[PDB]
């Protein structure tokens, strides 16, 4: 569904406060720690035996910065999330072979990283707004799966 004015406000005002490099590194590290099968999709980044190896992988830290920068482009295209994400959807499907159930697992890790960095801004209502965003973005990345 469309975002209403109150949802848009929560999303836009919070995102302005987010350190996307730090949050992005954190979210990518946590998904590879919490859901270890996801390591198979990145076996070209090296060392991913254990959490210590993941937190000290410079390739994981940098890739996490680029995933969150890209997710944060949703916030400038709230109207057009599906259309904006279509090529990335295609690349995930065709080039990286990622199973689309995984997109919702990362959406939930991003909500946990935001909660832990901005605990006063992440009210009940704000979290509801972000949860809708993350669900739209996971669906847009799943959409070109054929």
């Amino acid at each position: 569904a469309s975002f209403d004015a109150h949802e848009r406000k929560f999303i836009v005002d919070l995102w302005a406060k987010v350190d996307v490099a730090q949050c992005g590194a954190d979210a990518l590290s946590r998904m590879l720690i919490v859901y270890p099968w996801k390591r198979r999709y990145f076996e070209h980044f090296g060392k991913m035996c254990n959490a210590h190896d993941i937190l000290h992988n410079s390739k994981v830290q940098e890739h996490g910065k680029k995933v969150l920068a890209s997710f944060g482009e949703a916030v400038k295209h709230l109207d057009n999330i599906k259309g904006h994400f279509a090529n990335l959807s295609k690349l995930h499907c065709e080039k990286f072979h990622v199973d689309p159930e995984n997109f919702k697992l990362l959406g939930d890790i991003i909500i946990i990283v935001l909660a832990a960095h901005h605990p006063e801004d992440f009210s009940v209502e704000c979290h509801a707004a972000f949860q809708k965003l993350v669900r739209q973005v996971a669906a847009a990345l799943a959409a070109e799966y054929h």
Binding site: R30, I33, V34, L55, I112, A115, P119, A128, Q131
Partner: protein, 141 residues
Amino acid sequence: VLSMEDKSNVKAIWGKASGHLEEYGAEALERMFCAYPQTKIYFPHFDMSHNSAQIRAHGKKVFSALHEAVNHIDDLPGALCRLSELHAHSLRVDPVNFKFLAHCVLVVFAIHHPSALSPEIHASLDKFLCAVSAVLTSKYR
């Protein structure tokens, strides 16, 4: 399938919530109702206002149950037997709803204890909440 380290991790993060079972439980429920409003069909009779007597009382029962689970983390099935009967057999709660509540429990620990919910700790707590959910959905008949 919870390791010894997973168990020590869960016991330590859980210790933070001691003294706060009602408050943390009330919040986990308000977040579940607001972020996933399809879960409200299970609670027709509830005042859904913020900090309603009913949501606080239910938050407390839920978290007290989860506290007992931590104290019997080697026998979840026997510690959660009655509750599995209730959820799966009498309420017929659709299984996807246990993932929402589990997620909202993580968010409550991230807001209140961000430094204590490190990546390895998050991984343990998440394994415990999946284990709890799997017992509560094990009696559909």
